[PDB]
Design a protein around this ligand. Sequence first.
Ligand code: MN
Ligand code: MN
Ligand code: MN
Ligand code: MN
Lengths: 201, 200, 190, 180, 189, 201
Amino acid sequence: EKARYFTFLLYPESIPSDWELKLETLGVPMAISPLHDKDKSSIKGQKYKKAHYHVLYIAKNPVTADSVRKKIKLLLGEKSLAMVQVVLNVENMYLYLTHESKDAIAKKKHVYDKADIKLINNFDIDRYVTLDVEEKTELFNVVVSLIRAYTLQNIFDLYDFIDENGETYGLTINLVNEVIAGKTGFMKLLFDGAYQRSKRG
Amino acid sequence: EKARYFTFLLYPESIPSDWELKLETLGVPMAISPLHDKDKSSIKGQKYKKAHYHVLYIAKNPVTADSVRKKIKLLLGEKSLAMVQVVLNVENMYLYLTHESKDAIAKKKHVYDKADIKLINNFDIDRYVTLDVEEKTELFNVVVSLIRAYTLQNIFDLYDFIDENGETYGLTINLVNEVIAGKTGFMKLLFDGAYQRSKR
Amino acid sequence: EKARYFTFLLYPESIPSDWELKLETLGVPMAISPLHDKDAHYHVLYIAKNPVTADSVRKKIKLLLGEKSLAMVQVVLNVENMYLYLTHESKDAIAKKKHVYDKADIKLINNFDIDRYVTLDVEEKTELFNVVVSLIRAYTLQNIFDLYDFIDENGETYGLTINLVNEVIAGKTGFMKLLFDGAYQRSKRG
Amino acid sequence: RYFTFLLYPESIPSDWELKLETLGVPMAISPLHDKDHYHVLYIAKNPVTADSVRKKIKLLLGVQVVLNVENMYLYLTHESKDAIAKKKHVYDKADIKLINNFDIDRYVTLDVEEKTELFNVVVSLIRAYTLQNIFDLYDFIDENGETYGLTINLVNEVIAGKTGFMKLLFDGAYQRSKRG
Amino acid sequence: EKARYFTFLLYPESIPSDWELKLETLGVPMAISPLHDKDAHYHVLYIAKNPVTADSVRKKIKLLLGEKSLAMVQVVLNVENMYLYLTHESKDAIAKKKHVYDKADIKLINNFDIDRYVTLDVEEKTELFNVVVSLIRAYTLQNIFDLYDFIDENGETYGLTINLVNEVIAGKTGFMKLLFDGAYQRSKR
Amino acid sequence: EKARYFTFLLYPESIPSDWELKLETLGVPMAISPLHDKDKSSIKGQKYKKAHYHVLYIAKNPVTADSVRKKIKLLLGEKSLAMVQVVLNVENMYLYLTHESKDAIAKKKHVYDKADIKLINNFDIDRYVTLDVEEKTELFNVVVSLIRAYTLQNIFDLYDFIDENGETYGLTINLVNEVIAGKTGFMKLLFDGAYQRSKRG
Ligand SMILES: [Mn+2]
Ligand SMILES: [Mn+2]
Ligand SMILES: [Mn+2]
Ligand SMILES: [Mn+2]
């Protein structure tokens, strides 16, 4: 059976020193967690789990669990992983790289530095979180009240506004963009409202 | 064949203890019924139906019955459901979670606590009460006579109007927005009518 | 056998004084004719939420107004035609010369709008649009307001209402802006 | 959307013709087919089933699905390709009864190529005479129409949808004439 | 087995003098090559109304020009390529260095128009569009009239006609108004 | 059932000598692999698979498996193929011509010379490198920040900008064109923003 998104673990003791450069060659975009060394282990006596890396590997096309497993073996050594699980929520796995996800936070796992995350081949978690249809409607309606409230005259004035106070309403630039897309028509109405409204004084 | 809204049953004896956290990961918003243990069963002798949970699972994009069924198997165990039905009225299935829907009320099913409902990933039933198609047409036609009558010159003057006298015609802001969406073209005609009418 | 649209008759002498408020409760949208005394009875246009039977209605109304208020529930085939029949203003009734009533006495329970029941053939849409054209051409109507104002008056003559233009021009909006610019820049010539 | 069925005069009321009118659906009814019954061309408002019609007519007076509306309209008079080669008894097209404003013409939709062909004519026409907007175009068609094979109601069906494209032509023409 | 497009050869010594008028009667649109003497024969591009067989053609022509006029009816796979072959101006014939003929000697029976037979690929549309772009950019063409005028003249050089631009820009109209506003406000500078 | 992209095999012993010129006539763009003679064969004893060619044949319009099979039979002989498969990933099948694809590389198949690939009728594997859909959204969002940052006023000022600094953001002209297509609506908003923003001095 086939899918695009996988994760597996890389073990420092059975991967070459140029491993980080070697994953880069696969051409596939990857995100690699900070070195997960301080994982509380549930074996008796021993303090932390063997030291490991978590990798978020997104294939170009829909491929199988094993096509990856052997693509990585023949690239880092037959002994580097064995356990390739298929990833169901890319956003969630990316947050898991730092134990900062919903699953991991409720399991109180040892939170890592998101700055240690390594992005091979231009991973940007941003290109993997599109939004629920309802969400789109919800945000759009916020964009409305926003253009209303501050009498934003045009999509530049809107962007400038989001640039600053963005987070407060939970918009970014690249987000408004995905929100207003297709509703453009409706936008020109708002922006004319605002224009001819500010022309009143 | 494909759709966005589904329901299926989760059985407590064949789902992990962290099942509730696990469904959270799917990223998909779900609403999960209170534990349906007191369902009158129609098998002879036995009192209540095997104890189960009802799930209302709304996919991000139009997907198939089976893409769900296996997404959940590989997430909870091959044995947790087998029966994924496609939901036709999201509001009604949400009311069915507590046996508080029209179907269930007339079947006299054992009413549950709506407080036991579990919302995974920010389900809000409020945002799937989209309008009957007719309603949209009806309301638009009101928005028309409204822009006509008060010579509202542009969507701001329209909003400002709704802000006040909204309820009287049964509009809110967020409601106009859902009404006029798509008919935007038609709007600019109304708002030019109005503009050039007041210029007279 | 099942259907959504029915009509029956209500008799004033065997229905309670709060009958009009009681029908409201059924939750079903209804249109009730003006008092049909100069044919004493009422005609009711009752459209069920879901496909239900002749008798599920007959008894829902008996247990709501008294066992003696109707007995005769017919199933309606053309909702628009039965709505016109409430005022004897339909094709059937007009040729039978029946006593025309005031459409202002029609009573709409639970937000009946006969409009939400008259959609139109696709050809019809094209046909009417083409009328709307010749209409904007002929009287050099400069914009949808001048169009509406026009329909408001002489509407019936071409068979338009406001709410009908709306359903006609919908989608063809593009095409409209061309007509309305024509008209505009045409009148700017004088 | 499109059906036909047969109405038998001995098992339909005397006001049958007025009763079909009420259904609100446009129908074309053949001349009385006695020299082979009535043939009915019934076009539903929306896509409906064989049986929703059969019972709608039963509960109204006491059904094959049509594939080519124009061909079934010609069959009402035995004047179609199928019937002419079967030498069937040709009837008077004047006995055809149009309920609720049937116009077989509203099913003379264009070959798709035709639409493209005509549009391209509408182009060269707006170019050549520098027609500035759809009124100037129409006025033009009104007179010289036949010469290019246009009517008003035909441009209308042609330009429909390509309206965008039109605004480009009409702005060309406008800013072209603004030149002197 | 059946197909719409065929070609065959007509020999002047075993076809009547009114042959050209006789093919006209078949009702089928044909294109006939210039007299191929310097390869004496004619090449015919015969497109049937409906999907018919190799032999229904071979005998329709025998019973129309004489049992001795052809025997060899091949089925045409690329109509455009066979029409180019009529003048030895096709990809096959040009690389075989065959004696190029005058395209003005081509005879079109019953309103053949090779045009109604060359539709184009989705990629082609994109390609052309991108040419129309650089064209509107380069010469600062301000609106679809100034574009047409341009194509009218220098059209063939970029491989456009009027009717072709029309099929190219169709649908992408939005995108057009942007080009034509660019051009307009560019020239206003 | 119908599709645009196919592949089949051509056998040198049952195809004419002018086969390469004959495929040219079909008018359809094809890519033909290097002569696949050194294919390890899984029949016992025998070393290489019968000698064959792989053809990547992209129809003008959506056509059926069999409309191709017979178009090729009546063009090369009834005995040249029998097996026409429908191609799912055009870029992947073009890489398979040389055994240089993901499938073939992991199966260790005998890599061929990409220089022996024959392109009939102007195949360019490139004019089917249409943008991953995500790519389109990513690029558009760049084009946005571009029009914002430099206050580009209209699609000519945009193009002029791409002409120069294009590579830096990974745009060409013909690429913007395939990016903005369809989002034209949204463009006009950006371009008005920019216009009325620069009108502010
Ligand atoms: Mn870990
Ligand atoms: Mn239950
Ligand atoms: Mn009465
Ligand atoms: Mn091979």
